[PDB]
Amino acid sequence: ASCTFTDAASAMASKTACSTITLNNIAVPAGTTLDLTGLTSGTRVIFEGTTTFGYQEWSGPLVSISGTDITVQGASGSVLDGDGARWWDGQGSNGGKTKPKFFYAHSLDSSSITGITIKNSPVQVFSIQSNNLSLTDITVDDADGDTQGGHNTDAFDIGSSTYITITNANVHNQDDCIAVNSGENIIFTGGTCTGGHGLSIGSVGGRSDNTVKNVTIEHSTVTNSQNGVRIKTVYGATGSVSEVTYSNIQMSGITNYGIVIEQDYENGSPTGTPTNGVPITDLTLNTVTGSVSSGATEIYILCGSGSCSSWTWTGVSITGGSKSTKCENVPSGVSC
């Protein structure tokens, strides 16, 4: 049966009995999840109009969807508006108000999400922990967070996932455009990332899953962001990052690091001393080009002893700013 809901309680009560679920202009109660987990395999979910959320200090998620063979779609003009300025205090997930993560895609397997627009997320947007999930034509409009205190507004956080494909994302936020904490067979292509902290592998380490393998981030643009390309592995942690390719990345207006690969990472501040428990091997950068701002550093590589090997570095050209005086353990064929 096809079902159309204008309230969250009805949608959650009846979701399994509906093979098409249209969610029209739903105001989700404060402190609660629009809980679309456990869907019957094959179900299509359509977001129409503007979805809103009541105010409460809590950890979220605001929305969660799970199931096999699920098709999630944002109708034309649809928006999931978190009105996150109600929470934003410059502190994000580091302190201040407790703020809800937006959209859990945990075990949304052999599934797709297309044409969803998120506006003004309180904190991180997509939490991806799935197998065979594509995210296409996703828009994260967190631009208001640049002046209203947004922080830790990651667009795509990926962990314990396989076969994730993100295509034609458009993100304006205040943190990582993508952050691959762990996963295998990941593609991010055709993205535009502005305002945030770059296209990041990591942080890797310190979790149950600390393994990244076969990730391609390609044909994408990073502008007006703290970093362009970033790999961050956690200080003193254990893990593995292998078969990562950044290819055909352009950047401009980068404020801190055009490319930064560091094995001393901590959330508060990098230690400045790398460790060697998270080896980065078979890393390819192929055509990573653009400019950084005058106060920025072009390329920064801080590798531990023996934990960066077998890299391929071709067509890398970052102009502007300054060259680093701090690079350590740079692999053969690579340069700051």
XYZ file of C-alpha atoms in Angstrom:
336
model
C 0.000 0.000 0.000
C 0.994 3.612 -0.592
C 0.914 5.771 2.535
C 1.169 9.518 3.088
C 1.848 10.889 6.560
C 1.723 14.403 7.973
C 2.779 13.391 11.500
C 5.680 11.327 12.807
C 3.699 9.112 15.214
C 1.466 7.762 12.441
C 4.430 7.146 10.120
C 6.287 5.189 12.801
C 3.236 3.128 13.760
C 2.417 2.141 10.173
C 5.793 2.094 8.379
C 6.072 -1.690 7.958
C 2.604 -1.876 6.358
C 3.497 0.666 3.644
C 5.603 -0.073 0.578
C 5.675 3.615 -0.374
C 5.971 6.117 2.474
C 5.529 9.816 1.721
C 6.461 12.175 4.580
C 4.846 15.569 4.003
C 5.792 18.624 6.089
C 6.284 16.634 9.283
C 7.167 18.463 12.498
C 9.157 15.859 14.439
C 8.606 16.100 18.226
C 11.447 17.571 20.264
C 13.853 14.989 21.638
C 12.603 12.207 19.349
C 13.792 10.446 16.210
C 11.766 10.297 13.041
C 12.357 6.559 13.319
C 12.109 4.843 9.948
C 14.263 1.889 10.911
C 13.148 -1.682 10.336
C 11.434 -0.980 7.028
C 10.112 -3.847 4.938
C 12.621 -4.695 2.210
C 11.855 -2.824 -1.017
C 10.155 0.179 0.621
C 10.430 3.619 -0.993
C 10.534 6.687 1.280
C 9.790 10.167 -0.107
C 10.362 13.427 1.782
C 8.026 16.228 0.677
C 7.919 19.854 1.753
C 9.815 20.985 4.842
C 10.581 18.559 7.682
C 11.184 20.322 11.010
C 12.284 19.308 14.491
C 11.427 20.426 17.998
C 14.084 21.887 20.270
C 15.672 19.803 23.028
C 19.235 19.229 24.180
C 19.960 15.602 23.260
C 22.254 13.477 21.111
C 19.885 12.401 18.320
C 19.508 11.116 15.713
C 16.811 13.411 14.332
C 16.155 10.921 11.520
C 17.075 7.268 11.134
C 16.364 4.880 8.252
C 17.265 1.215 7.906
C 16.334 -1.791 5.830
C 17.389 -3.660 2.699
C 16.561 -2.543 -0.863
C 15.251 0.813 0.407
C 14.888 3.794 -1.930
C 14.991 7.177 -0.151
C 14.140 10.272 -2.185
C 13.800 13.978 -1.589
C 11.040 15.406 -3.728
C 11.678 18.596 -5.672
C 11.962 21.543 -3.294
C 12.005 19.316 -0.203
C 14.189 20.241 2.780
C 14.969 18.649 6.144
C 15.463 21.862 8.140
C 17.179 21.301 11.473
C 17.124 25.016 12.421
C 20.430 24.266 14.122
C 21.115 27.838 15.238
C 18.861 27.010 18.196
C 21.742 24.814 19.432
C 24.832 26.364 17.814
C 27.194 27.852 20.387
C 30.574 27.572 18.638
C 31.261 24.349 20.554
C 29.554 21.624 18.523
C 30.101 18.176 20.009
C 33.003 19.423 22.186
C 30.821 21.085 24.813
C 28.110 23.624 25.440
C 24.615 22.420 24.614
C 24.088 18.751 23.852
C 23.255 18.689 20.149
C 21.547 15.987 18.047
C 23.172 14.204 15.134
C 20.948 14.472 12.071
C 20.565 11.365 9.915
C 21.533 7.793 10.782
C 21.936 5.377 7.891
C 22.878 2.299 9.928
C 22.211 -0.975 8.091
C 20.527 0.857 5.209
C 21.917 -1.820 2.933
C 21.607 -2.390 -0.818
C 19.807 0.948 -0.715
C 19.946 4.500 -2.039
C 19.354 8.082 -0.885
C 18.804 10.679 -3.620
C 17.985 14.372 -3.749
C 17.856 14.983 0.008
C 18.587 18.541 1.160
C 19.584 19.086 4.804
C 19.479 22.656 6.130
C 21.187 23.923 9.279
C 22.070 20.691 11.025
C 22.660 21.096 14.796
C 25.902 19.099 14.527
C 27.043 16.188 12.296
C 24.775 15.280 9.365
C 24.989 11.738 7.934
C 26.211 8.846 10.080
C 26.848 6.085 7.535
C 27.285 2.507 8.765
C 25.936 0.393 5.909
C 26.805 -1.954 3.040
C 26.039 -1.092 -0.594
C 24.554 2.356 -0.048
C 24.615 5.205 -2.556
C 24.035 8.879 -1.719
C 23.363 10.966 -4.826
C 22.550 14.649 -5.299
C 22.757 15.338 -1.548
C 22.884 18.972 -0.437
C 24.053 20.119 2.992
C 23.161 23.792 3.453
C 24.879 24.750 6.713
C 26.071 28.146 5.404
C 24.338 29.968 8.274
C 26.712 28.098 10.601
C 29.652 30.192 9.331
C 28.372 33.215 11.289
C 25.924 31.671 13.787
C 28.258 29.289 15.613
C 28.133 26.019 13.685
C 30.814 23.500 14.607
C 31.428 19.770 13.991
C 28.833 19.926 11.204
C 30.396 17.026 9.226
C 28.454 16.182 6.081
C 29.321 12.464 5.708
C 30.807 10.378 8.532
C 31.559 6.800 7.464
C 32.465 3.877 9.698
C 32.117 0.099 9.507
C 30.798 0.394 5.957
C 31.400 -1.228 2.585
C 30.473 -0.150 -0.939
C 29.473 3.453 -0.178
C 29.167 5.741 -3.214
C 28.605 9.489 -2.803
C 27.967 11.328 -6.086
C 27.427 15.044 -6.747
C 27.299 16.156 -3.127
C 27.137 19.898 -2.472
C 28.200 20.861 1.057
C 28.630 24.187 2.852
C 29.488 23.457 6.508
C 32.053 23.959 9.284
C 33.817 20.572 9.473
C 34.808 17.615 7.290
C 33.018 17.310 3.971
C 33.698 13.581 4.233
C 35.339 11.784 7.155
C 36.136 8.111 6.594
C 36.760 6.716 10.080
C 36.730 3.144 8.716
C 35.358 1.239 5.754
C 36.145 -0.547 2.515
C 35.311 0.165 -1.138
C 34.252 3.802 -0.782
C 33.801 6.352 -3.577
C 33.197 10.102 -3.301
C 32.952 11.727 -6.727
C 31.738 14.996 -8.234
C 31.505 16.801 -4.912
C 31.699 20.489 -4.072
C 32.847 21.204 -0.511
C 32.988 24.707 0.925
C 33.402 26.247 4.367
C 34.459 23.036 6.106
C 37.594 21.102 6.980
C 38.165 19.213 3.732
C 37.976 15.744 2.204
C 39.283 13.637 5.065
C 40.362 10.087 5.625
C 39.987 9.757 9.375
C 40.259 10.228 12.114
C 41.445 6.599 11.996
C 42.141 4.868 15.293
C 40.726 4.644 18.808
C 37.485 2.878 17.815
C 36.245 -0.679 17.363
C 36.853 -0.367 13.598
C 40.076 1.370 12.522
C 40.546 -0.144 9.045
C 40.292 1.920 5.847
C 40.828 0.103 2.552
C 40.152 1.018 -1.088
C 38.748 4.548 -0.937
C 38.634 6.844 -3.980
C 37.910 10.551 -3.555
C 37.836 12.067 -7.008
C 36.607 14.732 -9.434
C 35.787 17.114 -6.589
C 36.395 20.692 -5.486
C 37.257 22.051 -2.026
C 37.026 25.806 -1.476
C 37.264 28.233 1.446
C 38.011 25.408 3.865
C 40.591 24.776 6.587
C 42.113 21.867 4.619
C 41.839 20.564 1.073
C 42.956 16.926 1.221
C 43.510 15.438 4.682
C 44.463 12.088 6.176
C 44.422 12.069 9.987
C 45.389 9.038 12.073
C 45.029 9.188 15.853
C 48.070 9.703 18.085
C 49.095 6.378 19.627
C 46.260 4.418 17.989
C 46.273 1.153 16.017
C 44.704 0.731 12.593
C 45.412 0.599 8.879
C 44.849 2.922 5.909
C 45.531 1.293 2.534
C 44.674 1.717 -1.158
C 43.449 5.306 -0.829
C 43.338 7.425 -3.992
C 42.723 11.153 -4.253
C 42.439 12.009 -7.942
C 41.450 15.136 -9.875
C 40.882 17.327 -6.807
C 40.908 21.120 -7.177
C 41.126 23.549 -4.271
C 41.207 27.271 -3.609
C 40.970 29.600 -0.644
C 42.294 26.948 1.756
C 43.221 28.569 5.071
C 45.372 26.015 6.976
C 46.736 23.149 4.807
C 46.291 22.417 1.111
C 47.234 18.787 1.777
C 47.799 17.497 5.317
C 48.657 13.907 6.241
C 49.478 13.541 9.911
C 49.830 10.655 12.336
C 49.698 12.772 15.526
C 46.012 13.658 15.337
C 43.874 14.365 18.391
C 40.530 16.164 18.423
C 41.682 18.965 20.723
C 44.995 19.566 18.952
C 47.551 17.389 17.137
C 50.427 16.511 19.446
C 53.134 17.496 16.981
C 54.802 14.069 17.362
C 53.602 11.238 15.094
C 53.236 7.582 16.016
C 53.460 4.524 13.760
C 50.536 2.267 14.720
C 48.249 3.274 11.823
C 50.299 2.599 8.649
C 49.314 4.505 5.502
C 50.293 2.382 2.492
C 49.466 2.445 -1.227
C 48.285 6.057 -1.102
C 47.876 7.650 -4.530
C 47.521 11.363 -5.189
C 46.969 11.928 -8.910
C 46.265 15.505 -10.049
C 45.656 17.353 -6.808
C 46.003 21.033 -7.645
C 44.978 24.529 -6.683
C 45.837 27.314 -4.275
C 45.930 28.152 -0.590
C 45.567 31.507 1.138
C 48.597 33.599 2.062
C 48.629 32.504 5.708
C 48.278 28.813 4.821
C 50.755 25.959 4.421
C 50.794 24.188 1.052
C 51.586 20.583 2.059
C 52.203 19.080 5.517
C 53.249 15.439 5.960
C 53.907 14.240 9.532
C 54.447 10.483 9.334
C 55.686 8.132 12.022
C 58.709 5.855 11.712
C 58.014 3.307 8.977
C 54.237 3.919 8.917
C 54.058 5.654 5.511
C 55.269 3.621 2.538
C 54.534 2.864 -1.121
C 52.943 6.143 -2.206
C 52.339 7.502 -5.712
C 52.333 11.312 -5.986
C 51.741 12.621 -9.533
C 50.488 15.970 -10.788
C 50.402 17.475 -7.284
C 50.706 21.275 -7.457
C 49.610 23.592 -4.628
C 50.367 27.304 -4.973
C 50.215 30.222 -2.564
C 50.970 30.415 1.120
C 54.208 28.930 2.424
C 56.093 25.656 2.297
C 56.126 23.608 5.492
C 59.221 23.510 7.694
C 57.784 20.639 9.740
C 57.454 17.605 7.446
C 58.735 14.270 8.802
C 59.193 10.780 7.334
C 58.213 11.805 3.800
C 58.066 8.707 1.543
C 60.093 8.191 -1.613
C 58.644 10.065 -4.579
C 56.730 12.490 -2.342
C 57.379 16.101 -1.367
C 56.036 18.868 0.810
